[PDB]
Amino acid sequence: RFLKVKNWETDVVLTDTLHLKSTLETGCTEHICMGSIMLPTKDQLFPLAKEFLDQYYSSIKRFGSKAHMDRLEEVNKEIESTSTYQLKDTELIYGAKHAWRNASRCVGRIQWSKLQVFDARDCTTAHGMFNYICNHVKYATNKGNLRSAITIFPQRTDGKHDFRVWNSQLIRYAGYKQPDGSTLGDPANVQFTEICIQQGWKAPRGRFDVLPLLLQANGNDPELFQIPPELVLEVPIRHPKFDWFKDLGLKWYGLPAVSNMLLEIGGLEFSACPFSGWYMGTEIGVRDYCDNSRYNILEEVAKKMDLDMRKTSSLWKDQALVEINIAVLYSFQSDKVTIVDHHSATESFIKHMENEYRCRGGCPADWVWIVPPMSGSITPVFHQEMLNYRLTPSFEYQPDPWNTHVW
Amino acid sequence: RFLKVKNWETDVVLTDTLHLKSTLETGCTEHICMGSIMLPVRTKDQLFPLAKEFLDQYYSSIKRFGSKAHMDRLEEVNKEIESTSTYQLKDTELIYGAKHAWRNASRCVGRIQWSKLQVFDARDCTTAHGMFNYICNHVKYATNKGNLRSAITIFPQRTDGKHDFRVWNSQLIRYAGYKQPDGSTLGDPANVQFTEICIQQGWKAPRGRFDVLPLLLQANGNDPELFQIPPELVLEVPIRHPKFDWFKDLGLKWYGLPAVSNMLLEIGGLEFSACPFSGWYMGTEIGVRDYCDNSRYNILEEVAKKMDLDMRKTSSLWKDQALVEINIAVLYSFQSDKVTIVDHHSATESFIKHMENEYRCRGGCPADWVWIVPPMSGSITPVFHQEMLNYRLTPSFEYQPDPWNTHVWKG
Ligand code: HEM
Ligand code: HEM
Numbered sequence: 001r002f003l004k005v006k007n008w009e010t011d012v013v014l015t016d017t018l019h020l021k022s023t024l025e026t027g028c029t030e031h032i033c034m035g036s037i038m039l040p041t042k043d044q045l046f047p048l049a050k051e052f053l054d055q056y057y058s059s060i061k062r063f064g065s066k067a068h069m070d071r072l073e074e075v076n077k078e079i080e081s082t083s084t085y086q087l088k089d090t091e092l093i094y095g096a097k098h099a100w101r102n103a104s105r106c107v108g109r110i111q112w113s114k115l116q117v118f119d120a121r122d123c124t125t126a127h128g129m130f131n132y133i134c135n136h137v138k139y140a141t142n143k144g145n146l147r148s149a150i151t152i153f154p155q156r157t158d159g160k161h162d163f164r165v166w167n168s169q170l171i172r173y174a175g176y177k178q179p180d181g182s183t184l185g186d187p188a189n190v191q192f193t194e195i196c197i198q199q200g201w202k203a204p205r206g207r208f209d210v211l212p213l214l215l216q217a218n219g220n221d222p223e224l225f226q227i228p229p230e231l232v233l234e235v236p237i238r239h240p241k242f243d244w245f246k247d248l249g250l251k252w253y254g255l256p257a258v259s260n261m262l263l264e265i266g267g268l269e270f271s272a273c274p275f276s277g278w279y280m281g282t283e284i285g286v287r288d289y290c291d292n293s294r295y296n297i298l299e300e301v302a303k304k305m306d307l308d309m310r311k312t313s314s315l316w317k318d319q320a321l322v323e324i325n326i327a328v329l330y331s332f333q334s335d336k337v338t339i340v341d342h343h344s345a346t347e348s349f350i351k352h353m354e355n356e357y358r359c360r361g362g363c364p365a366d367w368v369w370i371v372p373p374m375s376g377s378i379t380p381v382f383h384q385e386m387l388n389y390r391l392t393p394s395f396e397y398q399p400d401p402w403n404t405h406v407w
Numbered sequence: 408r409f410l411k412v413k414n415w416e417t418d419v420v421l422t423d424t425l426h427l428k429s430t431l432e433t434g435c436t437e438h439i440c441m442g443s444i445m446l447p448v449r450t451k452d453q454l455f456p457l458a459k460e461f462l463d464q465y466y467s468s469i470k471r472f473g474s475k476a477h478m479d480r481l482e483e484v485n486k487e488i489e490s491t492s493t494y495q496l497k498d499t500e501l502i503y504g505a506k507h508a509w510r511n512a513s514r515c516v517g518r519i520q521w522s523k524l525q526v527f528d529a530r531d532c533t534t535a536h537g538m539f540n541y542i543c544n545h546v547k548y549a550t551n552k553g554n555l556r557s558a559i560t561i562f563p564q565r566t567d568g569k570h571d572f573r574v575w576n577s578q579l580i581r582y583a584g585y586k587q588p589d590g591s592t593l594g595d596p597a598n599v600q601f602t603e604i605c606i607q608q609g610w611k612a613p614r615g616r617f618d619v620l621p622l623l624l625q626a627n628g629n630d631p632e633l634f635q636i637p638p639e640l641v642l643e644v645p646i647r648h649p650k651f652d653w654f655k656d657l658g659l660k661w662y663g664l665p666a667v668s669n670m671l672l673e674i675g676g677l678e679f680s681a682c683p684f685s686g687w688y689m690g691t692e693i694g695v696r697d698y699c700d701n702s703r704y705n706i707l708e709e710v711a712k713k714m715d716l717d718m719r720k721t722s723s724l725w726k727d728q729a730l731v732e733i734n735i736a737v738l739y740s741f742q743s744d745k746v747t748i749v750d751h752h753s754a755t756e757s758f759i760k761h762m763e764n765e766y767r768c769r770g771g772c773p774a775d776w777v778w779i780v781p782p783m784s785g786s787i788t789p790v791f792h793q794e795m796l797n798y799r800l801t802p803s804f805e806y807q808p809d810p811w812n813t814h815v816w817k818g
């Protein structure tokens with residue numbers, strides 16, 4: 001039960017002890033591996049709080065202290081009285097940093113302890129939510145010198161007064177269904193772009209329209225707000241070699257900000273906790289641009305490159321894929337917006353694994369998600385065995401609000 | 408139980424009932440997934456139910472379940488087991504077994520071809536010389552002057568684990584690797600240890616960059632013997648690029664026949680420790696892994712230089728750019744010489760169809776996403792977007808230890 005992980009390129013072996021702490025289930029069994037599957041009371045609450053405070057207090061070298069036992073009693077009483085409890089600012093920050101640290105699908109976790117935590121638990125309205133988000137966006141963007149941040153809205157109570165950001169990311173481009181069956185803009189957001197328009201939103205109906213924010217506070221109906229454009233940093237995409245690339249008329253946004261996840265800390269649930277870091281190049285160039293159910297531009301680019309598209313054997317797609325990804329990197333770098341290529345990021349994740357195994361006894365990791373969607377085996381993470389397991393505090397998926405909301 | 412898998416690019420949802428027939432363990436638990444872990448003398452006590460399970464399958468496949476022929480066969484096997492401690496498969500059962508082991512091989516993307524497998528029965532073999540002969544015939548038949556045919560040669564099964572037949576080579580055809588005293592490496596670094604063994608065993612090495620290794624062959628538990636495959640039986644392809652003329656001057660070539668020879672084949676509880684099989688290459692096996700892995704020939708540098716790429720920063724994606732051209736050259740060279748090969752787009756696409764068909768006809772298709780997804784351009788192949796369930800069915804191909812670590816030397 002003391003598992004080893006091997007890097008097959010370096011023969012480096014690491015021993016994993018951290019997994020023994022894990023409590024939540026993987027979805028796997030002894031008979032079947034589900035590693036490639038995308039989606040996996042008062043009496044419940046106190047042991048959860050206890051486990052968290054124990055590790056919090058251990059992390060600061062006061063395990064078993066008076067202050068430890070005291071915080072424990074104090075929280076125990078508040079749960080017994082209120083049926084919930086409130087985190088101290090220090091515990092909140094710790095919890096958030098550790099949810100990131102525990103995110104087995106995030107390749108950028110080497111940065112985990114440098115997170116800026118915005119406490120938004122005093123928020124009561126969607127306008128208030130918008131204000132906190134504009135502040136997050138402006139701060140995180142930092143004129144292109146990106147800084148990791150999370151903003152944390154009030155925790156769930158009854159489940160009918162949830163704070164929710166309806167957007168999947170704070171900044172995304174619209175998707176419109178044409179009359180000729182086609183799709184203009186981002187196909188992933190066709191449904192959300194629909195709801196925004198359903199709720200008002202004058203759609204410019206372009207290829208790249210910044211979606212409006214759709215914010216839900218205390219379980220009320222959601223409200224539309226438009227992010228000040230001067231806060232949405234965007235990058236025109238050109239190639240350092242192909243002058244015609246400019247004329248594809250592509251661009252992307254600089255701030256990658258996940259807004260639809262649920263943050264769990266010491267048994268408490270934060271249903272609205274948008275966070276942001278900075279892009280790995282492939283997220284945009286490989287997935288956003290070249291995924292078939294997304295912008296799917298491969299053909300158009302290969303046309304422009306005059307490649308033999310008559311046989312898959314020519315690897316025309318691969319050739320275009322590389323150039324596109326070159327362009328993305330080049331463009332962000334030229335405009336001074338933070339970005340990391342898949343080589344640097346995976347190399348840094350390897351060193352991070354080394355660090356975590358050394359100081360924590362392990363690092364949960366999802367190989368299926370960690371390995372970049374291009375050039376897999378020429379990145380070191382490919383040759384790195386990884387153990388996947390769920391530690392708390394965590395970021396979890398949660399249902400889309402429009403399927404759930406008592407509208 | 409019933410399990411659903413979803414393709415996130417097509418929304419196609421498939422239902423798996425087949426995983427219920429799985430008996431062997433995966434390595435995972437409710438609390439840990441070991442899906443990325445590379446690697447995660449039998450008594451009459453356990454053997455008959457293993458026999459029966461296999462015989463029940465086989466007779467179901469031929470639509471004779473519960474027949475007198477089925478029942479008599481069970482009876483015959485049971486009697487032979489308790490009298491002799493083991494049993495022999497009929498030719499029909501062996502062929503079925505070998506094909507289904509391939510069919511059940513969750514790490515093989517080439518399984519659309521599973522039913523077209525040429526089975527050579529080498530169970531009458533007694534000596535290494537005999538093994539060489541069988542293996543030569545296999546290579547000649549499988550190669551077929553470039554028009555490759557999938558085949559497997561099956562040597563006698565294990566008895567007491569002291570008389571194992573083994574092919575010591577990891578593949579029937581592979582290049583030698585030589586560690587130089589300066590730390591550098593000549594040839595294929597993956598083969599340094601094995602190359603050293605052959606040399607110790609008496610192989611006179613030419614010490615080049617592409618020396619075809621000798622066969623090191625073990626029959627009946629005896630010490631292994633060296634043989635040289637007749638060079639005219641080894642089809643090789645010089646690698647060139649369709650636009651880049653300096654590419655041929657890299658001096659690269661590869662062999663045409665990919666043949667795994669170190670695995671163990673299990674059928675009805677019987678263990679076949681020598682069972683070399685061969686298909687044909689997916690281009691990335693060579694162009695990406697063989698040529699570009701840092702721990703292999705590792706040509707990215709030399710290629711990128713000759714391409715005059717900006718090699719100063721990784722952000723230029725010079726490595727990615729070179730990798731593509733190399734894989735273009737490998738596919739080009741094989742097609743030009745009419746030697747069977749398949750690109751990663753074509754092969755993954757066929758696998759999806761195979762998979763869909765297996766779910767409908769068989770109730771599932773065990774697959775290892777980690778291995779099925781090609782080592783370049785992953786998400787522009789449809790397998791990246793396919794949820795897959797991994798589980799173990801028998802008959803099966805299993806890993807076994809390297810014979811030099813276990814062999815008892817007669818002297
Ligand atoms: C700062 C640099 C960062 C980099 C380079 C980075 C990189 C990535 C990448 C490439 C993915 C895969 C996303 C996908 O394929 O959909 C990912 C996922 C994820 N990241 Fe990060 N990230 C960063 C910051 C953060 C921060 C600040 C947090 C939280 C505080 C975070 C938490 C997560 C989580 C929970 C996932 C899984 C998302 C999902 O399952 O959909 N990351 N990250
Ligand atoms: C006909 C063309 C075939 C193609 C294109 C193909 C493709 C592949 C590829 C790309 C791999 C991954 C190898 C690696 O990355 O190390 C693989 C693995 C495997 N294949 Fe095939 N294959 C073919 C035929 C066969 C045949 C004839 C058999 C057996 C009768 C077979 C059984 C297996 C097994 C057992 C593995 C796992 C190997 C391991 O774990 O080391 N395949 N296949």
Ligand SMILES: N#Cc1cccc(CNCCc2ccnc(-n3ccnc3)n2)c1
Nearest residue numbers: 038106169256257258275276277278397
């Ligand atoms: N549910 C769901 C679900 C399934 C597959 C992918 C998805 C998107 N995952 C996040 C993608 C994304 C976008 C922008 N930014 C970031 N990001 C930023 C820092 N770390 C990740 N991540 C969600």
Ligand SMILES: N#Cc1cccc(CNCCc2ccnc(-n3ccnc3)n2)c1
Nearest residue numbers: 445515578665666667684685686687806
């Ligand atoms: N143990 C082990 C282990 C770890 C990584 C790669 C490995 C080789 N896997 C097979 C490679 C290979 C070579 C030639 N041919 C084929 N081949 C033929 C048909 N299907 C695959 N496969 C073994």
Ligand SMILES: C[C@H](O)[C@H](O)[C@H]1CNc2nc(N)[nH]c(=O)c2N1
Nearest residue numbers: 036037038368369791792793794
């Ligand atoms: C089916 C498969 O699990 C799915 O396509 C996964 C594969 N790996 C991934 N990896 C990352 N980083 N992001 C993803 O969306 C996915 N999708």
Ligand SMILES: C[C@H](O)[C@H](O)[C@H]1CNc2nc(N)[nH]c(=O)c2N1
Nearest residue numbers: 382383384385443444445777778
């Ligand atoms: C650690 C990791 O599982 C290992 O590098 C695997 C990844 N996927 C693979 N996939 C294939 N086809 N072949 C391999 O050798 C590997 N190696």
Ligand SMILES: [Zn+2]
Nearest residue numbers: 028033435440
């Ligand atoms: Zn698993």
